[PDB]
Write a protein that binds this ligand. Structure first.
Ligand SMILES: [Mg+2]
Ligand SMILES: [Zn+2]
Lengths: 49, 49, 98, 178, 267, 134
C-alpha cells in the first residue's frame, strides 16, 4: 500500500483504485468526491494520479 | 505525479525503482535532515555544509 | 486485566451522585468487577461568582461532593455496560486508569 | 602553549563509530595525543518500553560528522585524512580548515548535559491529536489527547464513556498511532 | 489521522458557532455596541471570544493569542500565535442577516499553519491545513477553474471603514465591471475568501482589511490552489489590508488590469 | 484527634459498606488498603467493623416511630453516620449523650449535605432517652 506522506501517498495524489477509498470505507460511484476519514483520501477515478 | 514515474514490481518484491524516485528520496532525505538540524541548535559549519 | 479503574466524581448535587454511584457499583458487582469503596472524601468548598449580566452597577461557594470509587476487575462486559450505561450531567467524571 | 581547537570532519552514512575508533587508534599509532584531544560523537538515548523498539533507542545529534579536539597542522591534517573512511575537513577551504567556535562547543556540551541527564523519549505527543487505545480496559477505542504529561506520563485523554466525553489517565504504554 | 492543532481549533470553532447560532434567535438580547466607524462589537462577540479563549487555554495555556477585541494576550510560548475573529461581518449579524462565520487560524513562526472558518447558519466548515489542503465538510477545494475575466464572478468588500479611498476603489470597480461578469458583496471577508477556496467566486479583492481577518482565509485559498497578493504582486498586504486573490491566471489578469487605475497611495 | 475523631476517619468504610454490601472484614481490608490512617485507634477500627451487628436496624428501629421522614430517603452518608453514632450507645455504650452527640454533630461537617447537622440534631433528641442516666 502507498505510504502516507510518501512519494505515492494516496492522500496527496489520489486513490490507487478507481472510486475506492484507500481504507475501504467507500467502494461506490455514488460517494465520489468525499474524502475519507480513516485514511483521508479523496474518492475519484485513479486517473487523477 | 506518481503515475509518470511508476514503480512497477516484478514477479516478487522486486520493484523497478525509477531513477526519479531515488533522486527524490535523496533530496527529501537531505531536506528532512537539514530541517531537523535547523531546529536543533544548528552548529554553523554543519548547517553550512 | 489492569486494576486501577478508579473513578473520581465531583459534583454540587447530592442525590444524583448517589444514583450514579449506586448504578456504577451495580454494574461493577454485576459484571464480576471487584468493586472497592466509594469512600466519599470530605466535601469541599468550591468558589463561584455571578459571571452573567450582573445586578445593575446566586451561589458563590458550594459544597462539592466527591465520590472516589475504584474498580479493579475490567472484564469485557464491564467496559461494555460502562460505555453503554450513561450518567447524569452536572458531574465531573475525571477517571484514572493506573 | 598550543591550544587545540575543535574541528569537524565528515564521516560516512553508517560508519561514524568505527571511524572514531580508528581515529583514536591512529593517534596512538603516531603517539599524537598531544595534538588530538578528544574525538566527540554526540548521541541520544530515547527510551520507550514497547512499540517495536523497546526499553531504549539510540539517536545522534547529527550524523555524517565527527567532532575532534585536534590542533591545526598539516601533519595532523593528513593524520586525519590517512584514515579508512572520511571525507575532507568539514569547514572553510580545504587544506586550511575552519575550527568551530568555542560558543559552538559550549552549546553542544549543554545539549549533552541535557540529553544525558534526562532520558527523554522522543516521538512525543501533542494536545489535540486523536489516538486509539490498545489496552484491555479500553481496547481499540479512540479519543483525543487533551493533555500530555511527561513525569507522571499518564496521557490526560478525552474519550467517550457513558455518552459524555470524559478525561482518562491511561499511560503511554497503551497509546496507538501518533 | 488529523492535525492536532487543527482538531482543537475546530472544536473551539464548533463551540463558538453553536453559541452564536443559539443567540441568533433572540435579537432582543444582543444590542448594537459600536467601536469605531461602523464596526459594531456586540456582547455576543465578547461571549464567543471568551468561549474560544477558554477552550484553547485548556490545551495551550502557553500560546499567545491575538484578537481584535483583547488585542494580544501574550503566552509563555510566543513562537506560535492564535489569530481569532469570533465574528466576521458584525453588521450582517446585527441586521440578523444569516450569513457570517467565526474564523480561527494558527500561525507558527509567523507563517500561517492551520485555519478554519465556520458558518453556523448553513452549517459549513471550511478547514485548511498546510501540506494537506483544504476541505469543505469532506470535499477538496480547488477554487474556480476560470482563466480569464469573462464569465468570472468577483467577490469583494468595500472600504466602508476607510472611505477616503472610496473613489479610487470605485474607479477600479468600474474598470473591473468592464471585463468581469458580475460582482458579489456579502460582508464578511473570511467567508468571501472561503468561497474563493470553494470556487463559488472566481476571485476576490478588498482594501483596508485587518491583519486578523485574512489570516484564516489566506491559507485557505493558498492550500486551495489559489494565490493572494497585494495590489502589485508584492507581499506588503499583511500591512496594507489590500488583498487580491483567486486562481493564478485570474489573479494575473486582475493585477494587470488594476495596476493602472490604482491610486499610488496603496502602492 | 485519634480517640474520638477515629469515627470520622472510617465513616467512609461505613458509607462504602452501606454501598458495597460485601463482607465487612474485606470492607475494612480495602479501606486500610486505601490509605494509612493514623487519627484512629485500631480498637475503634474494630468497633466500627463490629458496627454490623443486626441492632443497626434496631437503632434506626430505636427511632423508627421517632422519625421526621423515611429511612431510605436519609442519604447513605447520613445513614452510616447516624447508624454508627447510635451504635456507640445502643449496643456499644462508649460515652454519654452530650459527648457522643457533640461527636456526631462535629464529625459530619466534612460529609453532610450542607444542612445535615440540623436534622440529625433535631432527630437525635432520641439520644436523650437511650441513655437516660445522662
Ligand atoms: Mg471580527
Ligand atoms: Zn479511507
Amino acid at each position: 500500500k502507498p505510504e502516507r506522506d510518501g512519494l505515492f501517498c494516496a492522500r496527496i495524489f489520489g486513490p490507487v483504485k478507481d472510486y475506492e477509498c484507500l481504507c475501504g470505507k467507500y467502494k461506490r460511484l455514488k460517494h465520489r468526491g468525499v474524502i475519507c476519514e480513516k485514511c483521508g483520501v479523496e474518492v475519484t477515478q485513479t486517473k487523477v494520479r | 505525479p506518481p503515475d509518470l514515474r511508476p514503480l512497477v514490481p516484478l514477479d516478487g518484491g522486486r520493484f523497478a525503482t525509477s531513477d526519479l524516485n531515488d533522486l527524490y528520496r535523496r533530496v527529501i532525505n537531505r531536506n528532512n535532515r537539514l530541517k531537523r538540524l535547523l531546529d536543533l541548535a544548528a552548529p554553523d559549519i554543519i548547517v553550512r555544509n | 486485566q489492569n486494576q486501577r479503574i478508579r473513578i473520581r466524581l465531583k459534583a454540587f448535587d447530592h442525590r444524583l451522585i448517589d444514583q450514579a454511584t449506586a448504578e456504577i457499583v451495580e454494574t461493577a458487582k454485576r459484571t464480576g468487577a471487584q468493586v472497592r469503596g466509594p469512600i466519599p472524601l470530605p466535601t469541599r468548598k468550591e468558589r463561584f461568582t455571578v459571571l452573567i449580566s450582573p445586578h445593575v452597577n446566586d451561589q458563590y461557594e458550594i459544597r462539592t461532593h466527591l465520590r472516589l470509587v475504584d474498580i479493579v476487575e475490567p472484564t469485557e462486559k464491564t467496559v461494555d455496560a460502562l460505555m453503554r450505561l450513561d450518567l447524569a450531567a452536572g458531574v465531573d467524571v475525571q477517571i484514572s486508569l493506573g | 602553549a598550543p591550544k587545540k581547537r575543535w574541528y569537524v570532519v565528515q564521516a560516512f552514512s553508517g560508519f561514524e563509530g568505527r571511524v572514531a575508533t580508528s581515529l583514536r587508534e591512529h593517534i596512538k599509532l603516531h603517539n599524537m595525543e598531544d595534538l588530538f584531544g578528544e574525538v566527540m560523537v554526540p548521541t541520544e538515548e530515547v527510551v520507550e518500553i514497547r512499540g517495536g523498539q523497546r526499553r531504549k533507542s539510540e539517536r545522534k545529534f547529527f550524523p555524517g560528522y565527527v567532532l575532534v579536539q585536534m590542533v591545526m597542522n598539516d601533519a595532523s591534517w593528513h593524520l586525519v585524512r590517512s584514515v579508512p573512511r572520511v571525507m575532507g575537513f568539514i569547514g572553510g577551504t580545504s587544506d586550511r580548515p575552519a575550527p568551530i567556535s568555542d560558543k559552538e562547543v559550549d552549546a553542544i556540551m549543554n545539549r549533552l548535559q541535557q540529553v544525558g541527564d534526562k532520558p527523554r523519549p522522543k516521538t512525543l505527543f501533542e494536545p489535540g491529536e486523536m489516538v486509539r487505545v490498545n489496552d484491555g480496559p479500553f481496547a481499540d477505542f479512540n479519543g483525543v489527547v487533551e493533555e500530555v504529561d511527561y513525569e507522571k506520563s499518564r496521557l490526560k485523554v478525552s474519550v467517550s464513556i457513558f455518552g459524555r466525553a470524559t478525561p482518562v489517565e491511561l499511560d503511554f504504554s497503551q497509546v496507538e498511532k501518533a | 489521522a488529523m492535525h492536532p492543532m487543527l482538531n482543537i481549533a475546530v472544536r473551539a470553532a464548533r463551540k463558538a458557532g453553536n453559541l452564536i447560532a443559539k443567540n441568533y434567535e433572540t435579537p432582543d438580547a444582543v444590542e448594537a455596541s459600536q467601536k469605531g466607524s461602523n464596526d459594531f462589537v456586540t456582547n455576543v462577540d465578547k461571549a464567543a471570544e471568551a468561549v474560544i479563549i477558554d477552550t484553547i487555554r485548556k490545551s495551550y495555556p502557553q500560546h499567545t493569542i491575538i484578537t481584535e477585541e483583547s488585542g494580544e494576550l501574550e503566552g509563555t510560548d510566543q513562537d506560535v500565535q492564535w489569530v481569532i475573529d469570533p465574528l466576521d461581518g458584525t453588521t450582517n449579524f446585527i441586521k440578523r442577516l444569516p450569513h457570517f462565520a467565526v474564523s480561527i487560524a494558527v500561525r507558527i513562526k509567523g507563517r500561517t499553519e492551520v485555519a478554519v472558518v465556520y458558518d453556523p447558519m448553513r452549517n459549513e466548515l471550511f478547514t485548511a491545513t498546510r501540506g494537506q489542503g483544504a476541505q469543505l465538510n469532506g470535499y477538496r477545494l480547488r477554487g474556480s477553474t476560470a482563466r480569464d475575466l469573462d464569465g468570472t464572478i468577483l467577490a469583494t468588500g468595500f472600504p466602508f471603514k476607510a472611505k477616503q479611498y472610496a473613489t479610487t476603489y470605485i474607479n477600479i470597480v468600474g474598470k473591473l465591471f468592464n471585463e468581469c461578469a458580475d460582482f458579489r458583496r456579502t460582508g464578511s471577508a473570511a467567508l468571501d475568501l472561503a468561497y474563493v477556496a470553494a470556487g463559488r467566486v472566481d476571485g476576490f479583492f478588498e482594501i483596508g482589511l485587518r491583519p486578523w481577518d485574512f489570516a484564516a482565509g489566506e491559507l485557505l485559498v493558498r492550500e486551495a490552489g489559489g494565490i493572494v497578493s497585494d495590489f502589485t504582486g508584492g507581499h506588503n498586504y499583511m500591512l496594507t489590508g489590500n488583498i487580491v486573490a483567486g486562481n493564478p491566471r485570474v489573479v494575473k489578469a486582475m493585477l494587470a488590469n488594476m495596476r493602472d487605475e490604482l491610486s499610488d497611495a496603496l502602492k | 484527634a485519634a480517640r474520638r475523631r477515629a469515627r470520622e476517619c472510617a465513616v467512609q468504610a461505613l458509607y462504602s459498606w452501606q454501598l458495597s454490601q460485601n463482607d465487612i472484614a474485606d470492607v475494612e481490608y480495602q479501606f486500610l488498603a486505601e490509605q494509612d490512617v493514623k487519627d484512629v485507634d485500631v480498637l475503634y477500627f474494630r468497633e466500627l467493623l463490629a458496627g454490623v451487628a443486626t441492632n443497626t436496624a434496631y437503632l434506626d428501629g430505636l427511632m423508627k416511630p421517632y422519625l421526621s421522614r423515611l429511612l431510605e430517603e436519609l442519604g447513605q452518608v447520613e445513614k452510616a453516620v447516624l447508624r454508627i453514632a447510635l451504635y456507640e450507645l445502643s449496643k456499644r455504650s462508649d460515652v454519654p449523650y452530650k459527648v457522643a452527640i457533640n461527636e456526631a454533630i462535629e464529625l459530619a461537617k466534612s460529609f453532610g449535605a450542607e444542612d445535615s447537622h440540623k436534622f440529625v440534631n433535631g432527630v437525635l433528641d432520641k439520644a436523650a432517652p437511650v441513655i437516660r442516666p445522662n
